[PDB]
Design a protein around this ligand. Sequence first.
Ligand SMILES: O=c1[nH]cnc2c1ncn2[C@@H]1O[C@H](COP(=O)(O)O)[C@@H](O)[C@H]1O
Ligand SMILES: O=c1[nH]cnc2c1ncn2[C@@H]1O[C@H](COP(=O)(O)O)[C@@H](O)[C@H]1O
Ligand SMILES: O=c1[nH]cnc2c1ncn2[C@@H]1O[C@H](COP(=O)(O)O)[C@@H](O)[C@H]1O
Ligand SMILES: O=c1[nH]cnc2c1ncn2[C@@H]1O[C@H](COP(=O)(O)O)[C@@H](O)[C@H]1O
Ligand SMILES: O=c1[nH]cnc2c1ncn2[C@@H]1O[C@H](COP(=O)(O)O)[C@@H](O)[C@H]1O
Lengths: 356, 356, 356, 356, 59
Amino acid sequence: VPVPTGGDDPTKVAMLGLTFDDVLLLPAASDVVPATADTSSQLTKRIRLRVPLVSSAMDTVTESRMAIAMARAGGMGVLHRNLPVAEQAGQVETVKRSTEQFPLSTKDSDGRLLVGAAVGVGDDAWTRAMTLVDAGVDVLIVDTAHAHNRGVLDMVSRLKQAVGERVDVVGGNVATRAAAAALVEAGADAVKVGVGPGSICTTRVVAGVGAPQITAILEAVAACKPYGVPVIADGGLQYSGDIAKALAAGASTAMLGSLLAGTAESPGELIFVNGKQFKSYRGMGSLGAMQSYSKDRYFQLVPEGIEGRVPFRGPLGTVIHQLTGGLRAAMGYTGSATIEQLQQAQFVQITAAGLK
Amino acid sequence: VPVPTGGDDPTKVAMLGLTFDDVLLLPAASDVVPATADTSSQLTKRIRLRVPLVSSAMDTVTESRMAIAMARAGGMGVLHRNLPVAEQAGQVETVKRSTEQFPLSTKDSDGRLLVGAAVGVGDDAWTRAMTLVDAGVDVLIVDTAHAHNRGVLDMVSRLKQAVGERVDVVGGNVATRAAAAALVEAGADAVKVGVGPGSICTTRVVAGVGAPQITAILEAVAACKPYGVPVIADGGLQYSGDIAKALAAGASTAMLGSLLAGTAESPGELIFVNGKQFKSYRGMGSLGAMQSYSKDRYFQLVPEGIEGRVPFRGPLGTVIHQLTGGLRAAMGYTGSATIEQLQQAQFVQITAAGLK
Amino acid sequence: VPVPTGGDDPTKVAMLGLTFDDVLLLPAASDVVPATADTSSQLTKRIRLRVPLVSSAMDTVTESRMAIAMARAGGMGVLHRNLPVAEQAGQVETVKRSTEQFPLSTKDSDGRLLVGAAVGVGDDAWTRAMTLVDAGVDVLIVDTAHAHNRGVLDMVSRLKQAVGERVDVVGGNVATRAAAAALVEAGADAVKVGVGPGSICTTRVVAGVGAPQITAILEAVAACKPYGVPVIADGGLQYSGDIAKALAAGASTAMLGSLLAGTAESPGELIFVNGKQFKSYRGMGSLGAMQSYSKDRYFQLVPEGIEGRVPFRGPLGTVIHQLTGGLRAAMGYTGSATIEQLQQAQFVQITAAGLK
Amino acid sequence: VPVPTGGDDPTKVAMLGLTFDDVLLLPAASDVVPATADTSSQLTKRIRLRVPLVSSAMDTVTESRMAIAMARAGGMGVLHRNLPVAEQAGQVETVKRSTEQFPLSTKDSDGRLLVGAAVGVGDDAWTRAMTLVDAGVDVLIVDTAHAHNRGVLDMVSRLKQAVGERVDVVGGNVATRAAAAALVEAGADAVKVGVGPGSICTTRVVAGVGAPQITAILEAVAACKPYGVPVIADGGLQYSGDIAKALAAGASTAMLGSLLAGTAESPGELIFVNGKQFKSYRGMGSLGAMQSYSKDRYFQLVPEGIEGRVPFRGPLGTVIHQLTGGLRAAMGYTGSATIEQLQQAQFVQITAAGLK
Amino acid sequence: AKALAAGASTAMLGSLLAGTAESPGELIFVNGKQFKSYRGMGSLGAMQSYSKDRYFQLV
Ligand SMILES: O=c1[nH]cnc2c1ncn2[C@@H]1O[C@H](COP(=O)(O)O)[C@@H](O)[C@H]1O
Ligand SMILES: O=c1[nH]cnc2c1ncn2[C@@H]1O[C@H](COP(=O)(O)O)[C@@H](O)[C@H]1O
Ligand SMILES: O=c1[nH]cnc2c1ncn2[C@@H]1O[C@H](COP(=O)(O)O)[C@@H](O)[C@H]1O
Ligand SMILES: O=c1[nH]cnc2c1ncn2[C@@H]1O[C@H](COP(=O)(O)O)[C@@H](O)[C@H]1O
Ligand SMILES: O=c1[nH]cnc2c1ncn2[C@@H]1O[C@H](COP(=O)(O)O)[C@@H](O)[C@H]1O
């Protein structure tokens, strides 16, 4: 009579959450050469990227240099907001002002590289958003840790009402079907997915809140797809196989953090330790980062992130090519000519024995 | 026809038990700022704490100093019984006799700090209980390792009949629905839950007996909530996320052990090892502690606890503030304005890959 | 339509196996003081031990001294058969020929200590069995690695027909319900259970054959209990909690290996390694031991055991007392007055998180 | 209403995959002595081996020396294709041209040793295959990493139409039932199974594509057995227990990789490190290996293999005898007189606790 | 060369010839490297017995 896990409510434990390590992609009938697979995918309803990768809006990942490199490589970059508004507007202008080297570069109708900017929630965030739109930003990301708040939805609706035809609006992080549906109703052009799985995240330890990434992507797609709203899987990706898994679950774009932090185009000074090279990497909720403009990320001290260092990886183009090659190999195995065909692939669930 | 795990009796393996690491809290529609969340909760049917934390009744955790500090911090402290009756009454008097900087201090009707005392089962325990009641204790915890015993229920009934109208009576550790129902029938004002999950506990190794804490809390709550009897989750809490999970499973109060052992207010001398500071922490059933007043906890040699050292943590106030901040973050994520609403949040079960 | 794990046959994967680490004993309504619990249990249909423990028939565990000590401690010892017949008969007579220090000692009608001996399968084994019966052994264990063989069953029937009224015959190791039923029909007085779970055993690695011990005990009890044939759990036991778990699963007696090899009474010299005292421990199918009278254990060199060292433990009485204290604690928690009541306790299955 | 793992599509997560560590062979009624079990099994529809083992077609495993040793031991060897066509034909001729020491030697009608050769896909592969056939090869393995491609099936049909009555054609790696059915329809004489589980493979990390080996064998066998097409399990085998499990899942032959890289007959110079003997072992798709005949395994840089060193194991005969002894022990435990009876054995699934 | 220049006419060699293949003893393999035993006549391994009169002898 009672639930086998305890209690009487069958919905007290909502579901069983799968992460990236719990699944593998099953091979299927393939007539696709990996070199000819089309990896282009929608970022928003009006923007299509040649490479379905986006740089995280973190102070140690994306600034003007990284944004330009990502835009040339085929993706896009989202500039962080841990700095004064005028400085972020200056970064946007630097990206917009900056031929055959980069056939995959992403550009607007005027031939200038695309760039995205992150804003918060509030009147100061409204002034920031208006300044960024005037500077010529292409897409605005309403970056909040928990986007199912009333204020986040109201801010997304106001931005779409004001500058909804000039720029695109992307909702904050969600992890459930209900939150994704609420963001879609508000009018977001895309939905960003993930609450908890960050590598530098301590939400699961400090707050005891989280959601495994594969299940969260599936639930959000289950709410976003009938309306044509793309999904951006944000956080938890460590290999190119994880990117392929995230895209096969229904996500149209993957946002990268630590995989791009150690590159040469990321900010921060290179550090030398015992003959090896490393670079800093900290979360926006870490004590060092919030000791400011971005401290309002979690409605603030109880830090919800950690600082660390990741090894130097070299130029960004090399990392992007490795990830795209892994994705192309996955597409060849699953017989997916396009990303829209990769989004229909099947998974096999593996036990703990397959991971040890 | 036969059970998949073996045999022919489907009730031989009663249920699948979930621990704190098996679940995460799912985000929900939130309209709550962490700084404005109300963390007050019921300890017994008549006592309400501003911070739902209670100190463990262990000789290395709670004495007069720790009890005063916990009562000032917004919670309460329970004095151990590993000492003669007169000394425990002296500790109670010291706490009661004892500052505008503490707005959250828990006080009785007369403005004196609240304190609790732990008693066992027996005629000596009855004399101890009478002395503590005369000394002015607020709550008596009938502390036994197995509270489903007949004698424990009889002692709880006797205490309620004698001094029930003056003090509250909390019943010892249970791990099933039937035991919680029996304690409620006996007349306990609150039920303490947990058999096995202690950090220094070896009941699972020595005796092979235990119960995962999340499932035990769910079962005990299903037994106690229809009568309005609060639940105190005791043991196994290592982070503020665990406190949030325990309160979301249904528990109204959490009792803290090793998290409080390394603070300044805890009894014990400071240990210096290689320039690092540690403090002693041992179970009340260990060889070094039972060698007596607590030796009768399991009707006793067979040690059922271990000794060890925990790193020095500093003042109690800092630790309590960090734990309460983590709890507030959880309340903000789940959209719970009060603890009574946090007790209705949903879980997501994660696999082994989610713990790697 | 197909099986979720693969193929179309739903019986290809017969069941899910639970080991000792997958379950815990659930506390129940108790009125039992651990000191007054009765640990007497049936070894065979006619022999009742004061302590439900038996020594393994291994050349590094049991000889005359260990058998004498075990019989005095309240259990019984089984002499290994890795030696000539005359030597084994001499060991039996040494035990039989050998005041108030040992009230729990096990004895026959003549007041002499009970002892058991292991025999193999064949004609030399028949001569060995007859010589041991003449020497005065009380129970014969037909020790084979796989007792579901036709030859082992026929040997058990022959022994029961010949010396049935003088000694008890215990069948070799089984791991399924069908094998237990086959041994019961052949006339065995006790069924010894376990194929794979030995600590020094490499059957699961070399042959890929095994069965988890909790499930195996449940399956074998489901066939032995209706006819009153006791079950002896052999192998995989590391703590007193495992002994309690094996007895609660239905076993009436546990056979101990490595828990007794490091004691003084076990054969072998005391090895000194970096100032620490160890003793040798090896399986009867190890390359060292099968180079011999135990070579017939696997119808055989393809070693199926390993050699190693176990720390010195001291006198056997102390180890037996520690194990019995753990068992008594389990009986107190589960509210079991006798072993027959312990055999009806319930398990809670734990996940992988509960083992980290 | 939704799927418990997320979304609304029940077929998104197709199945739960089992690997070798997840299962164990259950003992059954046995009349089989390990030394008298028949280990002969089919390789193709016309070739029967005495030992059901085949050497891998890798540049660090099999050449003329290893092929001859495997053919003398009772198995077979498949020559790698990372060298010019004339060189591979020379190796085949050397094997075909190279008394009672080897009673189990596998030979054709003309008394010469059997040998197999690996070919790719394309016109150059067609020329290679015709040259090898003109050199007297016995079986051709159409070797690809993903055999569900249209080109692979067409190549298999072409080879069977051309030289189908002289040599046998084995289809490359598959992991599902549909792929095995496609290879069977294409005319393959045997189907090789496994995509991902190689020890030197990085397909699961780079591409996120894979299939657990036990489940893949079960599915492929369900596809092939009604038509009498043998299944060769390739990859993931680390012990003789794994070989026994692979054969019990339905496979007729296991192809060995790292288990044969440290043998004396394996190509490559012996390497000394700190007085210990190791040998190099690398995949056919590794960066060093493809730096151009084998570069086309995955339609290729994005490496999908790794390099390393494995301990030197000595002569091949010793390893083959040890593996066969483990297989014989499994046959004795499961009561299987022949391999066709071992293929009907049952499994027991074990939990993670059984692996710790 | 120094010994011969000091005045000696011949040098008698010990350990410089112990490890040659023509010397008595068994080859020892340690971590893949080849060694040979070499002991003094007064050593405990050698004087434990003939040739105990080397120094009128156990120290
Ligand atoms: O301090 C933080 N805590 C939690 N999540 C963060 C923090 N800073 C950024 N994030 C998010 O978590 C993601 C982690 O990316 P990853 O390191 O690639 O897993 C980032 O891309 C952000 O979306
Ligand atoms: O010796 C002991 N054995 C088992 N449990 C104990 C012992 N001493 C205290 N406990 C309980 O275990 C809890 C451990 O708290 P923790 O250290 O926060 O897990 C205490 O609060 C007591 O409820
Ligand atoms: O060589 C061997 N191979 C496999 N099992 C063995 C061997 N020797 C003893 N055993 C079994 O393992 C038991 C002891 O296991 P332990 O209690 O884990 O040491 C014995 O009672 C036998 O049933
Ligand atoms: O470069 C490679 N990458 C991945 N798999 C490979 C490669 N080369 C060979 N294989 C396959 O992986 C298997 C590895 O065998 P194992 O080391 O016994 O698991 C081989 O027998 C081939 O079937
Ligand atoms: O046990 C011994 N003690 C002292 N001198 C020895 C002993 N054995 C040999 N010798 C002498 O010492 C010399 C050592 O020569 P070397 O090996 O060139 O140093 C030998 O050639 C002998 O003359």
